[PDB]
Scaffold this motif. Structure first.
Motif, PDB file in Angstrom:
ATOM      1  N   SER A 111     -95.906   0.187  13.289  1.00 35.61           N
ATOM      2  CA  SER A 111     -96.478  -0.457  14.368  1.00 35.61           C
ATOM      3  C   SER A 111     -95.917  -0.243  15.793  1.00 35.61           C
ATOM      4  O   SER A 111     -94.742   0.145  15.734  1.00 35.61           O
ATOM      5  N   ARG A 112     -96.468  -0.580  16.813  1.00 37.51           N
ATOM      6  CA  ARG A 112     -95.895  -0.412  18.026  1.00 37.51           C
ATOM      7  C   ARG A 112     -94.815  -1.155  18.249  1.00 37.51           C
ATOM      8  O   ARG A 112     -93.462  -0.899  18.459  1.00 37.51           O
ATOM      9  N   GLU A 113     -94.992  -2.486  17.877  1.00 44.17           N
ATOM     10  CA  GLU A 113     -93.949  -3.682  17.838  1.00 44.17           C
ATOM     11  C   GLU A 113     -92.618  -3.209  17.269  1.00 44.17           C
ATOM     12  O   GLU A 113     -91.662  -3.660  17.468  1.00 44.17           O
ATOM     13  N   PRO A 144     -90.236  -2.798  20.219  1.00 48.13           N
ATOM     14  CA  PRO A 144     -90.265  -4.282  20.233  1.00 48.13           C
ATOM     15  C   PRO A 144     -90.656  -4.760  21.613  1.00 48.13           C
ATOM     16  O   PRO A 144     -89.931  -4.461  22.351  1.00 48.13           O
ATOM     17  N   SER A 145     -92.067  -5.585  21.976  1.00 45.50           N
ATOM     18  CA  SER A 145     -92.086  -5.984  23.138  1.00 45.50           C
ATOM     19  C   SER A 145     -90.989  -6.989  23.637  1.00 45.50           C
ATOM     20  O   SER A 145     -91.107  -7.416  24.689  1.00 45.50           O
ATOM     21  N   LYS A 146     -90.217  -7.509  22.683  1.00 45.85           N
ATOM     22  CA  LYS A 146     -89.271  -8.447  23.225  1.00 45.85           C
ATOM     23  C   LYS A 146     -88.426  -7.769  23.792  1.00 45.85           C
ATOM     24  O   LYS A 146     -87.579  -8.213  24.533  1.00 45.85           O
TER      25      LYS A 146
END
Lengths: 85, 50, 110, 122, 97
Positions: free
Chosen positions: E83-85, E89-91
């Motif tokens: 997954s992209r996340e 990680p978008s965090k």
RNA sequence: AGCAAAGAUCUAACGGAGAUAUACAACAUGCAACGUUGGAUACUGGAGCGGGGAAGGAUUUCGUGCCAACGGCACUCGU
RNA sequence: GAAGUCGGCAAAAUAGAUGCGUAAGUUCGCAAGAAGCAUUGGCUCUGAGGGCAAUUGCCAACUCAGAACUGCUUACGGCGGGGAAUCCAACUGUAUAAUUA
RNA sequence: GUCCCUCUCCAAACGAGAGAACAUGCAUGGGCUGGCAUGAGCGGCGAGGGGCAGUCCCGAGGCGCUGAACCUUGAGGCCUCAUGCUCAGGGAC
């Protein structure tokens, strides 16, 4: 390329419609037919238009070795053997 | 294991001494019966649980 | 009567001897074929594979075995002291060659 | 790595520049040259080998003089304004010995901080 | 003869396991008649027992692929298995901003 | 009957009684199998047939000799 | 292509990631990965995303997007088939060690 | 004279069978025939790119030598088209 597992047919031969029991190479006896022969199918004069000499190894698409050398012609091993001259 | 009481250690000390074979001469005592030691032992069978 | 101590070399066509053999058995079985191949033409038992020929059969692993091999075959005469009959043995060794075509079989005149 | 690289820039890679001065390496050929296994020919070929096969920035065979290759006496020297690893001249020598197929015989080992010495095997 | 004893000590002296210790097959008479550590280090010194180099695990095929992949070559849409996340990680991206 | 999960062993030299064992050449009349060392190939694949401890075992550890029985095949090896 | 069979049992099938899209019903939380459509390689480039030092100079580590050219024999491992409804228990959990989960 | 050992494969679980018995028999090689799809190596078309001042390099693919390379009888395709091996066949009734 000969009959697979048999080779070239050197002597006079009978050519006979249908399968015959037994594998290649085996002796067999043809005997004068016992069953009464009166019928359209069993009284007829056979006239063959064509006999298939194409290789039985693979899919033979050529009837004669000349038909093959026409579809290829000069070839790398042939361009060589003329240098023996 | 590494742990042992000393009281337990000795009981295995005694049982290690008792595994020796019957002396060769003691067969030659006049009127002798004992041939091979019948109380011998191997850890693989009959385990002392001390 | 060809002498004792003759050394000849020849191709063994291995690909036909190993056809359809279980893969895990290819390399170990290819050696029993060479001892049996060499053994019957030199007519001896105790055929000995050098490291050069052993490692060649195994260098692709157990499955892939090279389709052909040139081997150099040296028979010699050795018997232990009190034997009644003479005892020969052969040393089969590899001869690395690039191609195969044309090589046939020929005796090394030694 | 800041500016991303390019393939096609693999021709002419920059090499770090030694800002202090000259650096000098030695390859001491005395021992094998004495026994004739080298000749004045192979020493002319050995210098030429490095002259042809050392690669200055990306490319080999063209050394402008930021690096000078001298055969003075029987010992080869390489004087360089560029930053090279001495390890790299041990590399080229072995790579020369394997064309002459002298490499089962002559070995090279570092006698001094800036030099290598051709020798023989026990 | 069994060199099993010498090969046990030469491995403990060289700090290598087996697959690296080398007992000289010619001198096997002289390797036996080493019964002790003091006598084995006399063989290690005299060249009848050698420690062999480690087998090669080369990282270079991976050094070439690293450079190529630093130009962005092999991470595409079809080469993404997660997954992209999970890849970025978008965090972590917003903490960076 | 069977001794079929866990992939798999191969070669040379040396050991050993275990051989290259014969009443008018060698194959056709001593077979198979064992250990160690070197070489080859392969597996485990760091949640390991890796290195250390508890419970439990208690001399299995270590060296030399040794093959009667025992390690459901074999040992020259071994707990 | 379920005609097999008590019964789709067993096998096949689906499949990663990204974008668009997604029904009835509903305790508004879900249903939902509903359903469904499409993209994916290799190569050569381009843009965006920063640190430090005194507009300028020097540098690290990666990710994402876009383009041109070129290729597919659709090609490791791993990895959901899905939809329309009825019966029952609300749910997670426990439970006949060795025929009943 | 038959059987074993040996070699062949119309036979075959093991027996048995068909055969051979210094025989193009076996081995390898050549040529056929067939499968795949144009090998390694090298060399002057390529989206773009990098040096030095037009050149010299980096670059997936591509083109030439190239229907090329490789394989082709083996549980056992063809052709004597060549050479090689055999040197009193052994044993049992």
């Amino acid at each position: 390329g000969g009959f697979v597992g048999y080779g070239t047919v050197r002597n006079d031969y009978v050519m006979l419609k249908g399968s015959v029991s037994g594998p290649r190479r085996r002796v067999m006896t043809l005997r004068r037919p016992m069953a009464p022969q009166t019928s359209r199918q069993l009284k007829e004069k056979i006239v063959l238009k064509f006999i298939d000499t194409s290789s039985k190894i693979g899919h033979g698409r050529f009837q004669t070795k000349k038909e093959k050398n026409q579809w290829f012609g000069p070839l790398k091993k042939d361009r060589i053997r003329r240098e023996e001259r | 294991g590494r742990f042992k009481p000393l009281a337990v250690k000795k009981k295995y000390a005694k049982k290690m001494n008792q595994n020796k074979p019957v002396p060769y001469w003691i067969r030659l005592r006049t009127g002798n019966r004992i041939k091979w030691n019948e109380k011998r032992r191997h850890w693989r069978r009959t385990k002392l649980n001390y | 009567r060809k002498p004792d101590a003759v050394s000849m070399e020849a191709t063994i066509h291995l690909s036909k001897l190993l056809k359809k053999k279980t893969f895990s058995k290819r390399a170990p079985l290819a050696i029993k074929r060479i001892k049996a191949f060499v053994g019957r033409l030199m007519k001896t038992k105790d055929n000995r594979i050098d490291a050069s020929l052993n490692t060649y059969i195994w260098h692709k692993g157990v499955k892939g075995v090279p389709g052909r091999v040139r081997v150099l075959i040296q028979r010699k005469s050795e018997t232990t002291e009190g034997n009644k009959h003479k005892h020969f043995y052969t040393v089969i060794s590899n001869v690395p060659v690039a191609s195969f075509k044309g090589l046939t079989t020929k005796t090394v005149e030694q | 790595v800041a500016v991303r690289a390019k393939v096609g820039s693999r021709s002419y890679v920059r090499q770090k520049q030694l800002a202090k001065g000259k650096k000098v390496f030695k390859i001491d050929c005395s021992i094998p040259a004495a026994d004739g296994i080298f000749s004045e020919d192979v020493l002319g070929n050995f210098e030429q080998f490095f002259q042809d096969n050392t690669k200055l920035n990306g490319r080999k065979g063209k050394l402008s003089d930021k690096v000078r290759l001298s055969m003075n006496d029987n010992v080869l020297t390489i004087s360089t304004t560029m930053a090279y690893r001495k390890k790299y001249f041990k590399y080229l020598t072995k790579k020369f010995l394997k064309k002459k197929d002298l490499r089962d015989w002559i070995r090279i080992l570092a006698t001094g901080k800036g030099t290598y010495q051709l020798k023989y095997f026990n | 003869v069994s060199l099993k004893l010498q090969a046990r000590l030469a491995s403990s002296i060289l700090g290598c396991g087996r697959a690296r210790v080398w007992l000289d097959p010619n001198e096997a008479v002289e390797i036996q008649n080493a019964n002790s550590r003091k006598s084995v280090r006399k063989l290690i010194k005299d060249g009848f027992i050698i420690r062999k180099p480690v087998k090669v695990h080369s990282r270079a095929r991976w050094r070439k692929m690293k450079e190529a992949k630093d130009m962005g070559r092999h991470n595409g849409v079809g080469r993404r298995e997660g997954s992209r996340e999970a890849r970025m990680p978008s965090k972590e991206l917003w903490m960076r901003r």
